[PDB]
Amino acid sequence: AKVVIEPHRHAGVYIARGKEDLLVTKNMAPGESVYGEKRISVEEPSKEDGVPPTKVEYRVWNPFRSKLAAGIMGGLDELFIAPGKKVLYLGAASGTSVSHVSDVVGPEGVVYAVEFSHRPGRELISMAKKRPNIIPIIEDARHPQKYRMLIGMVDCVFADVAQPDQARIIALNSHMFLKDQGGVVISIKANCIDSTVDAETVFAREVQKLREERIKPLEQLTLEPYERDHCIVVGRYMR
């Protein structure tokens, strides 16, 4: 028989049950192969005239590739990613995890892919010629006043970098394009900062700098072993 796919505890993030346990989003530009992935064609059977009822395609989405999926599977109650919002996706580095953000953000949402490297941007524009919601910028991510003309503003911000100066790097963006009570979602990798030392001191000084730049982390946790020595940090700006 066929599976049933029900929505999870955030809208736009759907879960497949039960002989398959897959975390799926809403496809809106079909025929693709981001990595040669499958697609799931589902519908609700109704009795209507005209056309048969619509098979709203859902595409699978792994925690082994994106930290945001593993943050959903690891346990969460509140999130700033929902259908319709505007997100600033800091760092993409291939353009593969962008399309799942463009799926889950809905058609109303606009995903701004940030990149400063010449090689992966050729796949960013490859994804951008496929889907009508993805705006790529090949811009310096350190200088917000050098891409202010291109972008408008976003509703929340995502930090995929794990750099030792990133407490400045999001700050120049958080002072610039994010509203009050805006959402800040960070994915800090512990061994990408420094590897001679335990992770708890690094996480403590990073959440200290989050308190310094007026970020209020409502929940911070290590994920669970879908990644190794990693944290995703959820905080609100000017709460």
Added chain:
Amino acid sequence: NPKAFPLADAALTQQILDVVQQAANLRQLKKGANEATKTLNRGISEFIIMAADCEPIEILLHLPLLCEDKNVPYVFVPSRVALGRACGVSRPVIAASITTNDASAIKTQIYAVKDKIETLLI
């Protein structure tokens, strides 16, 4: 060549040529970038040593891409003749691969040099 990164200093270069030379004793070496590419596909390589002054450089650049795909460390070393001369061949080698054994007698030096390379990549 600005493409040659991460490029090494003197003492680490001497240590890496030494460890390569001892592995070249124990029949535990792969030579030529073609064979090293096959080891990176088959997933048997500890790491990859690539000569930085390889002219033209176009023949080499895919190996670090596939390295960071499979999360396998790598180091550029600034001269090819010391590399292939440290492999026991009287012709230049530009890229070579070290294989994996859970009972090889040179294991600790392999792990220490790997720790140096993971320090270089971060």
Added chain:
Amino acid sequence: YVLTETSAGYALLKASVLKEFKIAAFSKFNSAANALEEANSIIEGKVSSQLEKLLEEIKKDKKSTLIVSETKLANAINKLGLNFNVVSDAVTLDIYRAIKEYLPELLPGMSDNDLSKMSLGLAHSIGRHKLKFSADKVDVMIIQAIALLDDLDKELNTYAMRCKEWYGWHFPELAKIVTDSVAYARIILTMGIRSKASETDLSEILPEEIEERVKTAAEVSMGTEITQTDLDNINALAEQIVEFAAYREQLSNYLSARMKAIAPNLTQLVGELVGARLIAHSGSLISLAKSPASTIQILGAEKALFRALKTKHDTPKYGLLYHASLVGQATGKNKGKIARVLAAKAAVSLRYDALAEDRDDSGDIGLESRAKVENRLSQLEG
């Protein structure tokens, strides 16, 4: 007091500190070249046309104390002859943040739709501009064209044999003499009926010792004779066969300059169709040049090779490289070694044209590779 930066106009805010969340002035730019050079203007810190216009029009009541966002924009407006005092403190400002919150409310006829579409169309333009190539890195069209060429030849000998089946009623004795499709179509397209045997229409098509056989065939052939309407459909059909015959020539001439466009050194090594079919059967260029040369030397005949790997026999030693003239120039023992050498250099030329420098440089370095192959072939013939 405030210069507004956006790619749809340059707006001075005095709302005409004393502010009222309105506009004092705005001076508009909106086109491809306007937004592209403004996009270069914010990155360069460059003084734009409408910026100097906004310094020229309003003055002495809103521009004596101007706050610019970029500190590079403090120097050029500082040295303006209109004698202005330019500071740049509190650029990060709730009012400056609150400019874009009312930007569809301050620009008449603009909303949140046209800013995003022009922002996307500008992001594609500056994205093609910075990466100095196209948005897709066009290589797929070779994969399309070499998929079309074989089907073109299939329609060609299809309709040629159809014409032979048709015209065999009037004149059956021709196919045993002339067997080529194109010369079969040209003869019927010139002659008409077999009673109209003329010499020059033989001379432009065939060699003479075949032509006399076609003439003596034109005597003794006593096939059926029929009205002119059939002859009209036949010469129409033969015009279509010569038409397609020129058409696939134009398609291969399209594949010529595209193959010399993308991979010049591969083209100098193995011509067009060889590396063309290798790029095709691979799937792309960049997935092909990342491969070992051993997989290159046997890419093609996957199934006989893998069958030999299952049953532990001799693995066959020719992939798709069995058709280039170098491989076809050796004999049974010299041949496979030239093939191994051939992939051993062909991987180098794939990585030549692969990694984004030889594409701009149009190729001079497969020429050495041909010398190294030829000199090995010379000593491998003694």
Added chain:
RNA sequence: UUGAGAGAUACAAUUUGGGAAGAAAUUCCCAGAGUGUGUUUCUUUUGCGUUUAACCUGAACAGUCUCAUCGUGGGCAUAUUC
């Protein structure tokens, strides 16, 4: 190691916050904190590294010739071994 400070775990008892039932007493379903006894982790006290403590290297000591590989023929046990 014996001292000195902290941490992890289980069993018994104790105690409480939420979801369902009952006037209450009491029961059903999640969550937490206390008391003892066991198991046990980390800093710190002290002995020790005399550095002939270990490892690597050009090694007369692979010479009564050595080693690998495919065969062959016997002994014992019931991916073999001699």
Added chain:
RNA sequence: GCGAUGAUCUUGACCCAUGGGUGGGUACAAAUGGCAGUCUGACAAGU
């Protein structure tokens, strides 16, 4: 104002209290459909 110049009768298959669902052929597109893991890897030629 009927037919051996075919009249008659049957080979779409089933089930249920117009309606409903399977069954098979054709064309189209895609496959966590088929590659233990897409060849071996250091000497040969001459004197």
